[PDB]
Amino acid sequence: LQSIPIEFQAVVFAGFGNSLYPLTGSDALPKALLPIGNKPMLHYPLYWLEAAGFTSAILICMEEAEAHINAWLRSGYEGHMRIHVEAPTILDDSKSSADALRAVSHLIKNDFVCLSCDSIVGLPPYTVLDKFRLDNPSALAVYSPVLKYEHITSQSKEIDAKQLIGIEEKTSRLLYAKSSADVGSDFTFRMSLLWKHPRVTLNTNLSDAHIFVFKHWVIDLIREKESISSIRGDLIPYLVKCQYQKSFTVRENIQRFLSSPSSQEIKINALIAKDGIICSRANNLPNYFELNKCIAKLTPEQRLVDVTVSERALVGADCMVNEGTTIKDNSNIKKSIIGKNCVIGKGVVVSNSILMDNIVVEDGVRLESCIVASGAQIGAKSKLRECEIGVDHRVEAGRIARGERLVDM
Amino acid sequence: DANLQEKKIFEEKQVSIFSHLDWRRRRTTENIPKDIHPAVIRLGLKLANYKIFGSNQRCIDLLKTFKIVIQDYQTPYGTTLSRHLTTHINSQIAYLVSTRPLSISMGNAIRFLKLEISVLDIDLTDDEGKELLLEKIDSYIRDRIIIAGQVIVQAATEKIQDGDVILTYLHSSTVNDVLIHAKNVGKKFRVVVVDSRPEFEGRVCLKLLTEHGIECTYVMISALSYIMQEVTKIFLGGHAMLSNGALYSRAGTSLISLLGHESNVPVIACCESYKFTERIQLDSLVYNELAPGDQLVNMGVDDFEEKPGVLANWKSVKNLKLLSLKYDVTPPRLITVCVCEMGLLPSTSVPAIINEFKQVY
Amino acid sequence: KHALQAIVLSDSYNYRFRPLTLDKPRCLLPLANTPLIEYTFEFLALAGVQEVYVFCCAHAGQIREYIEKSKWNLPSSPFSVNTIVSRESLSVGDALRELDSKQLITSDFILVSGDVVSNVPLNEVLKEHRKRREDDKNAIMTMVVREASPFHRTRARTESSVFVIDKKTSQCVHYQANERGKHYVSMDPEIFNEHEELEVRNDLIDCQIDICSNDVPALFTENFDYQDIRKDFVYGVLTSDLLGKKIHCHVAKENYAARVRSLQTYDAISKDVLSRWVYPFVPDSNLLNQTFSYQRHQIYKEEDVVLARSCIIKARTLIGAYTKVGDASVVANTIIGRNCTIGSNCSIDSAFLWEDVVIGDNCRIGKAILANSVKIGNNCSIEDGAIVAAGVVIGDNTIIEKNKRLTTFESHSQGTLNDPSLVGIGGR
């Protein structure tokens, strides 16, 4: 306590790569470690936190990943924050975002921020804290225009579903949030709502960014309410129903019960607020198809490469290749990303593709717009178009388009 | 840098009248120093973003915040509390002033608290020193403002006569707190609510008085000549009273007093005592505080409703500049009474009252 | 090209104001001592209309007699008004068919139901309409509505509706009325896949001033089931019951617009008129050579009026010419027709008085409508909601309870003329 208390403390989530099958199957690398711009996807939520003013945040990962993660935090984390890791044994896969911090509730002491390992965000951090500081709500949620993919919509059968956002522009308060999961046959709208806030803007091209800022007391609700599995799934709509539904008068006693927002006489609460915020540039969260884009979208980069050998009769430009990797004669890299110390054979062509770490590709192959997990390997004269390659997996002279190639089991 | 900025702040004494008025405002938490208490942050945001922030509630919230600062202060082991505490607090003020200039109300509170730190008994301990001046603060909020308000309203409502037609202007919480009283004590009267551009502060006064069942009449300042013929008394709540007897309140306050005196209505000034200043102003331009010029671009009857105008590029067009002063001074020959907690005094009697409190030996 | 047509559906709201709609129809009764149809005409004049057709079903002669004599029959009138007669109790849809069956619509036009009061210059909204039409001939109607408050005193249940508009192109993608009992708002999601920003609004008014294209009549002869402009037409387009057409809302954010449909509106609009919310359309303008003059606190008088000493007039009061007011009487928030006359030591509040009305000495009136040529004796009293017709007389020392409507004919209500006329009865 350097004369000043702490305002919030930050929470980062690192669940299983639920919808990133060909890349998140193995336990040798978890969702929170896929490279993005030759940097693990975890580097970005923390960097946003680090510049936000935080000096230490806590992270809750699945038990199968507690080993590799902090290893990167020990050697590989470019930041300077002090990350408390946590691996609850309750995480039975059926759990989700809310169930997680329920197990580690006793760590929160003030209001808190709930990011996620995929929370890629260039939004300046002051814009989210001030609006929470200014409006003093019960929660704040960041939403973004849905990510537009430069290349043709190859196949997008599982892209973060679709969301419907109801926000009142004047107060910036949020009044409707329902994804197409709890669907509606003849889709509904509570008229009892429209009698206050009779103007509700409805956005359809908006996607979540998993940047929520709750007041401290919400945890007291999370501990009590066992019926909250996912924050984005269950918590937010619960908070939005209580905003306007009259008869939904189940005990809000959690408000007054010495919550300490004065802090004696009541000049606050007497109502539950819930706002939202939208931007315009660089703000979304990987659920597979974003990994191809949020990495491509991650070349406002600069220039050079380091500790890498690209022999003569070889070219590469505006790409990103990490340390140690090698490229052998008559091959070409184009508009592509290559991770740490990979091996690129002779006379091969990898274009518009993402290459993680520790992979070796034999000679004379073609890689047109593909993603290859770490530790992988592809055989000579193979050709892949729009295909994903599992971790530590290999293929021998194969050929297919639109295929998820994985070590069979 | 500061001297470099001080060089800039010198060159801002050019042909323009408003060259010297400081426009530098920080409305964000970008690049904030570390020694800034959270409860101070939330305040500095409210100062730069709120608009119906009365000069009273500011001083309260500032003090209540300052308690939380001192309560959480921790002196180094090699130095007592009194030494090296203002320095901490001074590092808080320098932030708050960069959000919005200190009101006169807030300033005198700083000058008072900075004093009690000095006179603080060294032979005490931390928890002795802290627990002490928190009462001094709570006492300051008791005697100097809250009670003083309750005296003014009662003292003011006494001169309200059945059949009056009261005129207020631009939402003064004090002036609202007396009309609502005069309603509840049974006085038969009615109110005129003069509002003005750009942030129509008058509506919230119209909103309050209406919800208390008060006959009200709402006109913009351009209708002063038209509306004064019905008014019999004028009630004003000030931001400060100068030592020459002048009243330092929002923009139109001068015209309100002027147009009234040229129609033989009295200008009754309701202002506390902690808002008295040892300074004096011959013109409403030497000491003042600006508002953003963009606020009067959205010409419509609204300010948030983003409907543009013709002046939206004024920042980019030469020989064109919009401005909006937030205060002006009203000569004492127009102020009829000042209603301090020492009773109804003539405005010229301010500096004595200031010198009366300096009895603090 | 040089033809802006416009039809007005009088009579279609004659039933709500029934007890008086006998001697005079509803499009002829006074609002602030001025009949409604003029409040609507000068509106259309603002729009630049040049050819008006008026449907009539009750007192057509009494209607046409005014029109043919009205200032709108002179050559200085901006438009050529012709009346049209049809069967009684005329349903909106059935009018447009008869309109189509007559071939009268040259191009885009406007239509109102009843009588409207407004100052909105339509010259800009139809410019919007004509625009987005000349690229999409399937935009057949655009609706004019006024932004307001969900609990605004000028927004009643018939005007209480819920719109959903495309915040970019302003297209009503869903509409539904407000009937207490309809707890939810159901929208087929298949619209979101065609719209990015939708604005659900319960703050509108629905002035029911729709601007229609020449398709609409032919679109009404076809699809003959449509009777109501909102319950049947709109719902048809939105449910694709009509071959894929579009409609639009032009939400006004200034000026004023509403129509007289209900007793709970006539009272409201009147106050919204005396309060100069519809300038220039204000008594002080005297468009029909009246002699009005604004006075402070929104009180309106006329030349050659006599106000006794000790008679006091409070705010929101209007006085027609040639009208007497006795001693020690108090009028407040009241509209008074011409040639009236008030007794002495009386008290009137929030009432409505028309032409050639007398009042006995020492009587109490409040929140009641008193029709043309009504005689009230002394000592009488009359409380809220009361409604009378013409010729009716009330004998001295009498009271009339709340909402006790009456008439002078043999019809449904409980009215008879002779004195006294409640406990002491005539006709029975």
UniProtKB/Swiss-Prot annotation, chain A:
It comes from the Eukaryota. Keywords: Cytoplasm, Initiation factor, Phosphoprotein, Protein biosynthesis. GO terms for molecular function: guanyl-nucleotide exchange factor activity; translation initiation factor activity. The modification Phosphoserine is found at residue 260. SUPFAM superfamilies: Nucleotide-diphospho-sugar transferases. GO terms for cellular component: cytosol; eukaryotic translation initiation factor 2B complex; guanyl-nucleotide exchange factor complex. Pfam families: LbH_EIF2B (PF25084), NTP_transferase (PF00483). GO terms for biological process: cytoplasmic translational initiation. It is found in: Cytoplasm, Cytosol. PANTHER family: TRANSLATION INITIATION FACTOR EIF-2B SUBUNIT GAMMA. Belongs to the eIF-2B gamma/epsilon subunits family. Acts as a component of the translation initiation factor 2B (eIF2B) complex, which catalyzes the exchange of GDP for GTP on the eukaryotic initiation factor 2 (eIF2) complex gamma subunit. Its guanine nucleotide exchange factor activity is repressed when bound to eIF2 complex phosphorylated on the alpha subunit, thereby limiting the amount of methionyl-initiator methionine tRNA available to the ribosome and consequently global translation is repressed. Component of the translation initiation factor 2B (eIF2B) complex which is a heterodecamer of two sets of five different subunits: alpha, beta, gamma, delta and epsilon. Subunits alpha, beta and delta comprise a regulatory subcomplex and subunits epsilon and gamma comprise a catalytic subcomplex. Within the complex, the hexameric regulatory complex resides at the center, with the two heterodimeric catalytic subcomplexes bound on opposite sides. This is Translation initiation factor eIF2B subunit gamma. It comes from Schizosaccharomyces pombe (strain 972 / ATCC 24843).
Swiss-Prot record, chain B:
Its main location: cytoplasm. The keyword Phosphoprotein applies. Keywords: Cytoplasm, Initiation factor, Phosphoprotein, Protein biosynthesis. It is found in: Cytoplasm, Cytosol. One of its GO terms (cellular component) is cytosol. The keyword Chaperone does not apply. GO terms for biological process: cytoplasmic translational initiation. It comes from the Eukaryota. GO terms for molecular function: guanyl-nucleotide exchange factor activity; translation initiation factor activity. Acts as a component of the translation initiation factor 2B (eIF2B) complex, which catalyzes the exchange of GDP for GTP on the eukaryotic initiation factor 2 (eIF2) complex gamma subunit. Its guanine nucleotide exchange factor activity is repressed when bound to eIF2 complex phosphorylated on the alpha subunit, thereby limiting the amount of methionyl-initiator methionine tRNA available to the ribosome and consequently global translation is repressed. Component of the translation initiation factor 2B (eIF2B) complex which is a heterodecamer of two sets of five different subunits: alpha, beta, gamma, delta and epsilon. Subunits alpha, beta and delta comprise a regulatory subcomplex and subunits epsilon and gamma comprise a catalytic subcomplex. Within the complex, the hexameric regulatory complex resides at the center, with the two heterodimeric catalytic subcomplexes bound on opposite sides. Belongs to the eIF-2B alpha/beta/delta subunits family. This is Translation initiation factor eIF2B subunit delta. It comes from Schizosaccharomyces pombe (strain 972 / ATCC 24843). The chain holds residues 106 to 466 of 467 of the full protein.
UniProtKB/Swiss-Prot annotation, chain C:
Its main location: cytoplasm. Signal peptide: none annotated. The modification Phosphothreonine is found at residue 158. GO terms for cellular component: cytosol; eukaryotic translation initiation factor 2B complex. One of its GO terms (biological process) is cytoplasmic translational initiation. GO terms for molecular function: guanyl-nucleotide exchange factor activity; translation initiation factor activity; translation initiation factor binding. It is found in: Cytoplasm, Cytosol. Component of the translation initiation factor 2B (eIF2B) complex which is a heterodecamer of two sets of five different subunits: alpha, beta, gamma, delta and epsilon. Subunits alpha, beta and delta comprise a regulatory subcomplex and subunits epsilon and gamma comprise a catalytic subcomplex. Within the complex, the hexameric regulatory complex resides at the center, with the two heterodimeric catalytic subcomplexes bound on opposite sides. Belongs to the eIF-2B gamma/epsilon subunits family. This is Translation initiation factor eIF2B subunit epsilon. It comes from Schizosaccharomyces pombe (strain 972 / ATCC 24843). The gene is tif225. The chain holds residues 15 to 442 of 678 of the full protein.
